[PDB]
């Protein structure tokens, strides 16, 4: 349904787009951001598809989104708050 992105996460979406555009052009840029949007939409409909990761930081869940990972909390409603979108190289499993 609805979701929130942190300022950090929004800025990273923009950097991903720009990086992909420079290397691959506008359609590749747009489709990869849409791929990330599908993963964000997946989590926002059922926040529990993400694996709980309190051992990283209390309250967070994580969801693999291809070559990135979404790290997110669930706010005072049923709403997910995407705090960071990190490259998979940082994902510990």
């Amino acid at each position: 349904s609805r979701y929130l992105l942190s300022p950090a996460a929004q800025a990273h979406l923009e950097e991903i787009w720009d990086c992909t555009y420079d290397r691959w052009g506008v359609d590749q840029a747009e489709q990869y951001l849409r791929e990330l949007q599908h993963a964000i939409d997946r989590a926002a409909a059922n926040p529990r598809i993400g694996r709980a990761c309190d051992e990283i930081r209390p309250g967070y869940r994580k969801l693999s989104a291809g070559s990135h990972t979404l790290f997110y909390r669930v706010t005072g409603e049923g709403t997910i708050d995407v705090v960071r979108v990190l490259h998979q190289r940082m994902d510990v499993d």
């Binding site: 300022p7 923009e14 940082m90």
Partner: protein
């Protein structure tokens, strides 16, 4: 400098199995290896925690309009 420990009965059986399987020689060899694994994990976990903290300190989270964002970015490249 030099400390001794006793293991519970499940992890003593785990260590016995690792020594029997041939990949480790002693209990200290298994423990020391496991603690190097833990420290390697913790260093990666530290990097993830700092990244999430920087994300929180970023500011309040807001809604985000993918259509508008993607529209604007495509338009800009067209300029």
């Amino acid at each position: 400098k030099n400390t001794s420990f006793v293991l519970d009965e499940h992890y003593s059986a785990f260590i016995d199995g690792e020594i029997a399987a041939g990949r480790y020689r002693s209990a200290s060899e298994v423990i020391r290896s496991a603690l190097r694994l833990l420290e390697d994990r913790e260093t990666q976990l530290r990097a993830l925690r700092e990244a999430l903290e920087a994300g929180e300190r970023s500011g309040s989270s807001t809604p985000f309009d993918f259509d508008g964002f993607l529209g604007r970015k495509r338009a800009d490249a067209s300029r």
